[PDB]
Short mmCIF file of all heavy atoms in Angstrom, two decimals:
data_model
loop_
_atom_site.label_atom_id
_atom_site.label_comp_id
_atom_site.label_asym_id
_atom_site.label_seq_id
_atom_site.Cartn_x
_atom_site.Cartn_y
_atom_site.Cartn_z
N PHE A 101 -13.63 5.24 -16.82
CA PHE A 101 -14.15 6.61 -16.86
C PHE A 101 -14.88 6.98 -18.15
O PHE A 101 -15.09 8.18 -18.47
CB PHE A 101 -13.03 7.60 -16.59
CG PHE A 101 -12.36 7.40 -15.27
CD1 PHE A 101 -11.19 6.67 -15.15
CD2 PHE A 101 -12.92 7.94 -14.13
CE1 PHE A 101 -10.61 6.50 -13.91
CE2 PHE A 101 -12.35 7.74 -12.89
CZ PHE A 101 -11.18 7.06 -12.78
N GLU A 102 -15.30 5.97 -18.88
CA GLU A 102 -15.97 6.20 -20.17
C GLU A 102 -17.13 7.19 -20.06
O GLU A 102 -17.26 8.12 -20.86
CB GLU A 102 -16.42 4.86 -20.77
CG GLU A 102 -15.26 4.10 -21.42
CD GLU A 102 -14.75 4.75 -22.70
OE1 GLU A 102 -15.44 5.63 -23.22
OE2 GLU A 102 -13.66 4.37 -23.17
N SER A 103 -17.97 7.00 -19.05
CA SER A 103 -19.19 7.81 -18.92
C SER A 103 -19.18 8.77 -17.75
O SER A 103 -19.92 9.78 -17.74
CB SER A 103 -20.41 6.87 -18.78
OG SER A 103 -20.03 5.63 -18.22
N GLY A 104 -18.43 8.42 -16.72
CA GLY A 104 -18.52 9.16 -15.48
C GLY A 104 -17.14 9.32 -14.93
O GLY A 104 -16.35 8.45 -15.16
N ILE A 105 -16.85 10.49 -14.33
CA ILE A 105 -15.95 10.59 -13.21
C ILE A 105 -16.85 10.80 -11.97
O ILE A 105 -17.71 11.69 -11.95
CB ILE A 105 -14.91 11.70 -13.29
CG1 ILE A 105 -14.17 11.73 -14.65
CG2 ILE A 105 -13.85 11.48 -12.26
CD1 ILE A 105 -13.04 12.78 -14.67
N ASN A 106 -16.65 9.95 -10.98
CA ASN A 106 -17.16 10.16 -9.63
C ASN A 106 -16.21 9.51 -8.65
O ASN A 106 -15.21 8.87 -9.07
CB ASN A 106 -18.57 9.62 -9.47
CG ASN A 106 -18.72 8.18 -9.88
OD1 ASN A 106 -17.98 7.29 -9.45
ND2 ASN A 106 -19.74 7.93 -10.68
N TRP A 107 -16.45 9.67 -7.35
CA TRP A 107 -15.50 9.11 -6.38
C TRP A 107 -15.45 7.59 -6.42
O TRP A 107 -14.39 6.99 -6.20
CB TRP A 107 -15.87 9.55 -4.95
CG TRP A 107 -15.55 10.97 -4.67
CD1 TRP A 107 -16.43 12.00 -4.50
CD2 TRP A 107 -14.24 11.51 -4.48
NE1 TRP A 107 -15.74 13.17 -4.22
CE2 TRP A 107 -14.41 12.88 -4.19
CE3 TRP A 107 -12.95 10.96 -4.50
CZ2 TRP A 107 -13.31 13.73 -3.98
CZ3 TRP A 107 -11.86 11.81 -4.28
CH2 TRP A 107 -12.07 13.19 -4.02
N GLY A 108 -16.57 6.96 -6.74
CA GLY A 108 -16.56 5.49 -6.92
C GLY A 108 -15.63 4.99 -8.01
O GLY A 108 -14.89 3.99 -7.83
N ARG A 109 -15.58 5.71 -9.13
CA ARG A 109 -14.64 5.32 -10.19
C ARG A 109 -13.18 5.64 -9.85
O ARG A 109 -12.27 4.93 -10.25
CB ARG A 109 -15.06 5.95 -11.50
CG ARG A 109 -16.44 5.49 -11.98
CD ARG A 109 -16.99 6.45 -12.99
NE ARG A 109 -18.35 6.08 -13.34
CZ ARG A 109 -18.67 5.23 -14.31
NH1 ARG A 109 -17.72 4.65 -15.05
NH2 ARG A 109 -19.93 4.94 -14.55
N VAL A 110 -12.96 6.71 -9.09
CA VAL A 110 -11.64 7.00 -8.55
C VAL A 110 -11.15 5.82 -7.66
O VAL A 110 -10.00 5.37 -7.81
CB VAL A 110 -11.62 8.31 -7.77
CG1 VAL A 110 -10.30 8.48 -7.06
CG2 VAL A 110 -11.88 9.50 -8.69
N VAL A 111 -12.02 5.32 -6.79
CA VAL A 111 -11.70 4.17 -5.93
C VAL A 111 -11.45 2.91 -6.79
O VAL A 111 -10.49 2.16 -6.52
CB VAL A 111 -12.79 3.90 -4.84
CG1 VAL A 111 -12.54 2.62 -4.10
CG2 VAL A 111 -12.88 5.07 -3.85
N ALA A 112 -12.26 2.71 -7.83
CA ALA A 112 -12.04 1.60 -8.81
C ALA A 112 -10.64 1.63 -9.46
O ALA A 112 -9.97 0.61 -9.62
CB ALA A 112 -13.12 1.65 -9.90
N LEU A 113 -10.20 2.84 -9.80
CA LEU A 113 -8.88 3.06 -10.38
C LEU A 113 -7.78 2.64 -9.41
O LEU A 113 -6.85 1.89 -9.77
CB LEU A 113 -8.71 4.55 -10.80
CG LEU A 113 -7.32 4.94 -11.39
CD1 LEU A 113 -7.05 4.21 -12.71
CD2 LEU A 113 -7.14 6.43 -11.62
N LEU A 114 -7.89 3.07 -8.15
CA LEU A 114 -6.90 2.66 -7.16
C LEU A 114 -6.93 1.16 -6.96
O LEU A 114 -5.88 0.54 -6.86
CB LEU A 114 -7.08 3.41 -5.85
CG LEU A 114 -7.08 4.93 -5.96
CD1 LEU A 114 -7.15 5.51 -4.59
CD2 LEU A 114 -5.92 5.51 -6.69
N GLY A 115 -8.13 0.57 -6.94
CA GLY A 115 -8.30 -0.87 -6.84
C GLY A 115 -7.65 -1.64 -7.97
O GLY A 115 -7.10 -2.70 -7.76
N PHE A 116 -7.75 -1.13 -9.19
CA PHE A 116 -7.09 -1.75 -10.32
C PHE A 116 -5.59 -1.64 -10.17
O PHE A 116 -4.85 -2.61 -10.42
CB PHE A 116 -7.53 -1.13 -11.64
CG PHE A 116 -6.77 -1.67 -12.81
CD1 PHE A 116 -6.77 -3.01 -13.09
CD2 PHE A 116 -6.04 -0.81 -13.61
CE1 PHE A 116 -6.05 -3.52 -14.15
CE2 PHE A 116 -5.30 -1.32 -14.67
CZ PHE A 116 -5.30 -2.66 -14.93
N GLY A 117 -5.09 -0.50 -9.71
CA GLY A 117 -3.63 -0.43 -9.46
C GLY A 117 -3.15 -1.41 -8.41
O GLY A 117 -2.11 -2.11 -8.57
N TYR A 118 -3.96 -1.57 -7.37
CA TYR A 118 -3.69 -2.59 -6.35
C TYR A 118 -3.64 -4.00 -6.95
O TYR A 118 -2.68 -4.73 -6.73
CB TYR A 118 -4.78 -2.55 -5.29
CG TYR A 118 -4.73 -3.68 -4.25
CD1 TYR A 118 -3.79 -3.65 -3.22
CD2 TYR A 118 -5.62 -4.74 -4.29
CE1 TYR A 118 -3.75 -4.65 -2.26
CE2 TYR A 118 -5.60 -5.76 -3.31
CZ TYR A 118 -4.65 -5.71 -2.31
OH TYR A 118 -4.62 -6.68 -1.31
N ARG A 119 -4.67 -4.38 -7.71
CA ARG A 119 -4.71 -5.68 -8.35
C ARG A 119 -3.58 -5.93 -9.32
O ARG A 119 -3.03 -7.01 -9.32
CB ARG A 119 -6.07 -5.91 -9.05
CG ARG A 119 -7.16 -6.26 -8.09
CD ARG A 119 -6.98 -7.66 -7.45
NE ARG A 119 -7.85 -7.75 -6.29
CZ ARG A 119 -7.63 -8.50 -5.23
NH1 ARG A 119 -6.54 -9.26 -5.13
NH2 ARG A 119 -8.53 -8.48 -4.24
N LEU A 120 -3.24 -4.95 -10.15
CA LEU A 120 -2.10 -5.06 -11.07
C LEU A 120 -0.81 -5.29 -10.30
O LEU A 120 -0.03 -6.17 -10.65
CB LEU A 120 -1.93 -3.77 -11.85
CG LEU A 120 -1.20 -3.70 -13.19
CD1 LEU A 120 -0.43 -2.42 -13.40
CD2 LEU A 120 -0.49 -4.88 -13.66
N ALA A 121 -0.59 -4.49 -9.24
CA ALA A 121 0.63 -4.64 -8.45
C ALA A 121 0.69 -6.04 -7.83
O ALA A 121 1.73 -6.70 -7.85
CB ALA A 121 0.71 -3.58 -7.38
N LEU A 122 -0.42 -6.49 -7.27
CA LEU A 122 -0.41 -7.82 -6.63
C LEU A 122 -0.13 -8.90 -7.66
O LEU A 122 0.62 -9.83 -7.41
CB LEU A 122 -1.74 -8.06 -5.91
CG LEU A 122 -1.83 -9.27 -5.00
CD1 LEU A 122 -0.74 -9.29 -3.93
CD2 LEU A 122 -3.19 -9.29 -4.33
N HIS A 123 -0.73 -8.75 -8.84
CA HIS A 123 -0.65 -9.79 -9.87
C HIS A 123 0.79 -9.96 -10.39
O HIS A 123 1.30 -11.06 -10.48
CB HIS A 123 -1.64 -9.45 -11.00
CG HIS A 123 -1.62 -10.44 -12.11
ND1 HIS A 123 -0.66 -10.43 -13.10
CD2 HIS A 123 -2.39 -11.52 -12.35
CE1 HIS A 123 -0.87 -11.44 -13.92
NE2 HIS A 123 -1.91 -12.13 -13.48
N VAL A 124 1.46 -8.85 -10.69
CA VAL A 124 2.81 -8.92 -11.18
C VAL A 124 3.78 -9.44 -10.11
O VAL A 124 4.66 -10.19 -10.44
CB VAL A 124 3.32 -7.57 -11.76
CG1 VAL A 124 2.37 -7.09 -12.89
CG2 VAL A 124 3.44 -6.55 -10.71
#
């Protein structure tokens, strides 16, 4: 979110939570 909040970055955030959860 350095430059933008938009819905695409919101989806990116959920995606990172998904990836973190899968990885651990």
Side-chain angles (χ1 to χ4, degrees):
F101 301 96
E102 282 290 346
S103 27
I105 312 185
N106 53 51
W107 286 109
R109 298 161 186 272
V110 172
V111 172
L113 178 64
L114 305 184
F116 174 58
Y118 173 77
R119 283 291 164 208
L120 202 215
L122 190 55
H123 179 279
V124 304

